[PDB]
């Protein structure tokens, strides 16, 4: 009773998991040292 | 300037970047195939 209904919910997260990781890097570029 | 004022802001994100990644994996465990 769950083909990919879950795979869809995660795909959403995957978009959020990356958004954050991108915010950390950019901030690092501001202070690499 | 700032020293680590940025490093602190990111550390916060790092906690959020992981929170999401954890939600995706756990969900995967629910549907590995």
Swiss-Prot record, chains A, B:
**Coiled-coil residues:** 4-33
Q: Where in the cell is it found?
A: Cell inner membrane
Family that this chain belongs to: Belongs to the major facilitator superfamily. Metabolite:H+ Symporter (MHS) family (TC 2.A.1.6) family.
Functional summary from the UniProt entry: Proton symporter that senses osmotic shifts and responds by importing osmolytes such as proline, glycine betaine, stachydrine, pipecolic acid, ectoine and taurine. It is both an osmosensor and an osmoregulator which is available to participate early in the bacterial osmoregulatory response.
Q: What is this protein called?
A: Proline/betaine transporter
Q: Which organism is it from?
A: Escherichia coli O157:H7
Stretch of the intact protein here: 468 to 497 of 500
